[PDB]
Amino acid sequence: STIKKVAPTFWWAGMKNPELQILLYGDRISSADVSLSADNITLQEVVKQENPNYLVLYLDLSKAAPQNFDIILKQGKKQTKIPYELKQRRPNASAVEGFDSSDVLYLIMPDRFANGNPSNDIIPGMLEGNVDRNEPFARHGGDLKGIENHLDYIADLGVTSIWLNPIQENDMKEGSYHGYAITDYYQVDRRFGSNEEFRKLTQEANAKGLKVVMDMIFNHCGSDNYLFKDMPSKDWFNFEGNYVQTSFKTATQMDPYASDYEKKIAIDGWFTLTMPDFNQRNRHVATYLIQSSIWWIEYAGINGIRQDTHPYADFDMMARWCKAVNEEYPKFNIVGETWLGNNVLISYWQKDSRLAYPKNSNLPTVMDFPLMEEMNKAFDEETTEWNGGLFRLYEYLSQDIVYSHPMSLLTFLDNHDTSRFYRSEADTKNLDRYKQALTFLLTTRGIPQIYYGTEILMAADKANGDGLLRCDFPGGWPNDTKNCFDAANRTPQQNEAFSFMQKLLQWRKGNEVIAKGQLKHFAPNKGVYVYERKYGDKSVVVFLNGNDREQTIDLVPYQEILPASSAFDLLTEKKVELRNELTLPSREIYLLSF
Amino acid sequence: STIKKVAPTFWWAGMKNPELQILLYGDRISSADVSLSADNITLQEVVKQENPNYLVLYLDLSKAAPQNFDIILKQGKKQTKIPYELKQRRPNASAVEGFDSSDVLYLIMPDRFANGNPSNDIIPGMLEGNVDRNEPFARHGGDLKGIENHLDYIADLGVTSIWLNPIQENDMKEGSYHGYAITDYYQVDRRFGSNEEFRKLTQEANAKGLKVVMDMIFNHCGSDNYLFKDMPSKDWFNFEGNYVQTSFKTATQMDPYASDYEKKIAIDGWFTLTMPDFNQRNRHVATYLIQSSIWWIEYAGINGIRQDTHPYADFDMMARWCKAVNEEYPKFNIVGETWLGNNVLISYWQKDSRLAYPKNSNLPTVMDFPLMEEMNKAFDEETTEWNGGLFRLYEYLSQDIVYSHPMSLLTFLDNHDTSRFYRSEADTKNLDRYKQALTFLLTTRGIPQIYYGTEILMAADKANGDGLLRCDFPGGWPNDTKNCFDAANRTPQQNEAFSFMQKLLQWRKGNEVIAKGQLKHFAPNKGVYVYERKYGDKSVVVFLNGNDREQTIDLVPYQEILPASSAFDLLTEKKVELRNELTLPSREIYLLSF
Ligand SMILES: [Ca+2]
Ligand SMILES: [Ca+2]
Ligand SMILES: [Ca+2]
Ligand SMILES: [Ca+2]
C-alpha cells in the first residue's frame, strides 16, 4: 500500500517498559490523521519531522493484553489500515539465562562458516548480486542453515555458546558479507535466512545445550538503510547527515585532557562514508535502536549481545540501553567492544568502574584486548629470571585491581578483526604455543571466546587484509575437497589441535572451579608460571614451562596450593609427583586436580 | 661512659605528638633502674628485650617546656647520668613549605658532585678507608661543603630545589659511597660533613631561594648499623634476623592473585645481605624510624623527603608515617619510590587511590617511572599517523584517570638508578631529543626532577654498572681539567644544552600557568603533538613536531586553544603565525604564551 516499512514488525504485551514506539515509513504520510482501533491501548503522541515520509507513534501498553489491532491513517478521502500484533509472551521470557565465566563462546562469521542452502546465495533485487568464493571481500554464500547443519560439531567441540557476527540485513553494493552495515534492523539478511530460520537455529542450538549471542551495532548503519537514504531528519545522524570521518580516538570520552574539537570528531565522526553515524542523543533514534535489541531477545531467545563500536557511541544513551535491557532480562549479559590499548581506559567502560565513578556504563562485560596482545607474545618469548614470555601474563593479571568485575572480561586469542593466533599456515607446524595459550585461556579468569577455525589451525595475517581473516571453513561448502567437520578428513596436526581444545573445553564445561573459583598465581620460577583456581575445597593447578628447555624447580613456594604429594595431569592422564622438586620438559603443561 | 649511643640525640618541646621514645645503647644496661630528673616529664614505660645492651624509654612531654634534664640509671653501686635536651622550636616550624608542581628538583649524589673539603675524604676509624676517583664503586670524596660552594650555580640553572641522595652515615666496608646502607640514622656521614654543616647548607640554600629534599630509607639499614650488628631482638628485622633474599616482586602488596609465600618473600625479604630488612611491624622499630624523619625536619628545615623502597615496607606503618609527618608539618611533601611497570600499581600507592580504597597510603607524591620509560623512546621514534613517537605521550597521559593526584607525580628523564637520558657521549651529538624531552617535561603535568649533570650532557648506560651512572661532576674537584660549573670551560654543545634548560627553568619558576593550570592536549597531527596549559585567562601552548622532517598541519583543530592570530616562541623569541596552517621544520618546538 502507501506503507513501505513498519518498525518494530510487531511487539508484545506485558513488557516491563510499557511504552512502544512504532515508526511508520511511506509516501507523504506525515500529514495523516492517526487513530487506533484497539483494546486498552493509548496513542500518546504522533511526531512529525522534516521528512514527510515518516510518522513516529508513541503508544502506552500498560493496560493492554495480547491482541490484534489496527493503526488508521486518514488523509482526505484515502484511509489506510495498518494491522499490528501484540503477541503473548512465552512464560519466563524475562528469566532467560545470560552467559558468564562458566561459558565459552564460539565466534562465527555466518557468510564464511557453512553454505547449507545455495539457493539463497544470490537474492533477486539485492544490490550485491554476486558470490565469488575466490574474492576475499565478496560474499561466499554462508548461511544460517549451514550453522544449523553443524551444531553437532560445535557441541562436540565442547563450547557452550555460539556467537554470530551480525545477521541483520546488509543490503549494500559492496562489503555486505561482514554484516557491519545494517540496512534493516528488523530483518535477517535474506542471503542468510528468514527471521524464522534464526529462531529455529536458536531453538536447535538450545536443545543441544548451546547459548546464542548476537552482534548488534548502534553506532552506525549502512548508507543504504532507509533511515539514512531517506532521513526522517538531519538530527538522526551526526554532523547533520554530512560525512565527517572519525579519528578513531575514543579515549576522548574519558581522557581528562581531551579537547572539545577531538571529542566531537571521534564520537560524532563516521566510521566510513557508507557507515553513517547515528545520533544516539535523538530520543527517536535511541528508542528505535533500544527496541530493536529487545525485539530480538524476546523473539529469538538469545542469551547475549555484543555491542560493537560501544565506545564510539554516546555514553549516556548506552548506559540507558544496558539498564533498559537488564530491567527486562535480569540475567542477560551484554559485552561491549572496548578496543583500547590499556586496562585503564577499558575498565572505565565496565559497570561499577571505580575510575568512571560516579558515572556508570552499566555494561556488565567488556573485552580484554590487552590480554590478547600479551597472549600473542607470551608463549613465543623466552621467560628469563626477570622478564619476558610468561611474565607478561603475571604482570598483566596483577593489575586486575583496575577492573570492577574481572570474571566478566571476555578473553580471546584473536577474532575477526585481528590476525589469527597463527599468522601463517607455516607457523602451525609447532603446536606448543597453541597448547600453552589455550590451557591458559581456558583455566585463568574471564569468559573465553574461540574464533571459528582455531580448532583446525586456520591461519591468517592482518597484513593481507580483513577478507582473509575470515576464510571459508573447509567443509562448509558442498564442493570442498577436504571436509574438516569430520576427523576422517583432517591432517594429523589438525586432529592433534582439535582433540586438545576439545579435551580442555569438555572438561571446563560444568566445572565450578574454573567458572567461580578464586585465582592465585606465582611469579615465573626459572621460567615456569604456576597458578591455582580454587572453589571451596576443590582446586585446579596449572604449570606452564615458559621455555624451550628442561627445567627443575623448587616446589616449596607452592606448598599452599599443593595439598597432596601427587596428582593426575588431565591432558596426558599421567601422574605428576609433587615432592620437593619437579622437572619439566620443554614447554611442559600440567593441569592438576585436587 | 657505659652509654655508647642515645637516640634521638635530642628532642623538642611542643611537638604535636607528645610521646618521645629514647633508645639507650650501652654495656649490660638493661637491668638498670631508670628515673628522670626533669620538670614536668613523665617516664611512662621502660622496655627490656633479649639483648641486655639496650633500654627503650617512653616519655610523655605533653606538659613539658624546653629544658635540660637527666636520665638516671642506677645499677647496684654504679650510677650513670645521661643529660638530654628538649630544645625550643623555631616559631612556625610546623608551617615549613613542602614542594609541589611549582618546583623543579635537582637530584645530587653527594659523593660525586663536588669536593669542597678534601680533609674529610678519609676519616680515621671508618671501615672504608679509601678514596679512588678511578674506581666507579669507590668513594670519590664529594661532600656538603662542595654542594654549598656551588649553590650559586644550581640557583642560576633555574631549579627551585636540591634533592640529595642519602647523607646519613654509611660506615660500611664496601659500597658506602651511594648512601643506601645507613649505619647511623642520627648522623650525617662524617665524610660528607657534620650535622651542623647540613643545617648550614639548608640555610644557605633557602637564602638563595632553593628548597631541600632528603632521601631516607626505612625498609633497610646497613649490616654495620649498631641496631643490626647488636640487635635489640630478633623481632627488629624480618626473617628473625636471618638473611632471606627478596624477590623484588612488590606487586604482591596489591595483586588480587598474590600468594602468601610470595608476599612474605617480597616484603619481608632482604634487598641484599648487607641491607637487612627492618620489621616495621615492631612498635619500637617504627617509632625509632618515624622519629628519625621528624628529627631531620625540625633540625634541618628540609621541605621534603623521598622514601626509597617505599613498596618494600609494611603498608600500614608507612601510612601511619605519612599521617604522623603531615600532622606535624601540614604543607610538607613526601614522595615514595614507586618503581613498578605500570600506572595501575603505582596509583595504588598514592594518597586517596581509588583502586586502594578503602585502604589509603596517605603518600602525597609517587614517582612516574612509566612516563620515564615512554619519554626515553618518544623523542627518537617516528610519529606516524596512527602510532609511535609522541603518541606514547598522548596515550600515556590519557590514562591519568587512574591517578588520584596527577599534579603530585614526580616526573623525570632519568635518575641515579637508570641509564642517563643520553646513554653514551656519542649520542649527545644531537640535541633535538634533549630539547623536545625537556620542553615536554617542564611544561606538562607533574613535578619535574633533573638529575645532576643532565644540563651538561653527562652520559651513561645502565649496562656498564651503577658506578658510572654517578660520575663526578667535571669541576667539582680541585684538580679537574675542565670546570663545567663555568660557561668558559664548557664545550659549545654543553653550553647549548645548559642554556636551553636554563631558559625553560628560569621561565617556569614563578609561572602559575605551569604550576597550577589545567592541561589539554591533542592527538599527534601528521606527527605533531600539541597541548595547552591554562590558568584563568593566561595560557601556554606547546607544539612538538615528532618527526625528522618539515610538516604543514591544519590549525583548525586547535581553535579552542589559539585565542590570537600570532604569538611569540619563548625559546627563539621569534613570532609564530597562527592562521589556518602552520609549517614546522624538522623537530620544531614552539612554546607560545597568551
Ligand atoms: Ca547459502
Ligand atoms: Ca558515533
Ligand atoms: Ca671531601
Ligand atoms: Ca621490607
UniProtKB/Swiss-Prot annotation, chains A, B:
Pfam short name (any one): Cyc-maltodext_N
Disulfide bond entries: none
Biological-process GO terms, alphabetical: starch catabolic process
GO CC terms of this entry: periplasmic space; plasma membrane
Free-text comment on the cofactor: Binds 1 Ca(2+) ion per subunit.
Feature type site, description Transition state stabilizer: 417
Subcellular location: Periplasm
EC class: hydrolase
Functional pathway: Glycan degradation; starch degradation
Binding site for Ca(2+): 115, 120-121, 141, 143
Keywords from the named record: Carbohydrate metabolism, Glycosidase, Hydrolase, Metal-binding, Periplasm, Polysaccharide degradation, Signal
Active site: 308, 337
Deletion phenotype: Reduction by 30% of the rate of growth on starch.
Top-level division of the source organism's lineage: Bacteria
Reaction(s) this enzyme catalyzes, per UniProt: Hydrolysis of pullulan to panose (6-alpha-D-glucosylmaltose)
Enzyme Commission number(s) from the entry: 3.2.1.135
One GO MF term: metal ion binding
Cofactor requirements of the protein: Ca(2+)
Family: Belongs to the glycosyl hydrolase 13 family.
Function: Neopullulanase that cleaves 1,4-alpha-glucosidic linkages in starch to produce disaccharides or trisaccharides in starch degradation.
Protein name: Neopullulanase SusA
Organism taxonomic ancestry: Bacteria, Pseudomonadati, Bacteroidota, Bacteroidia, Bacteroidales
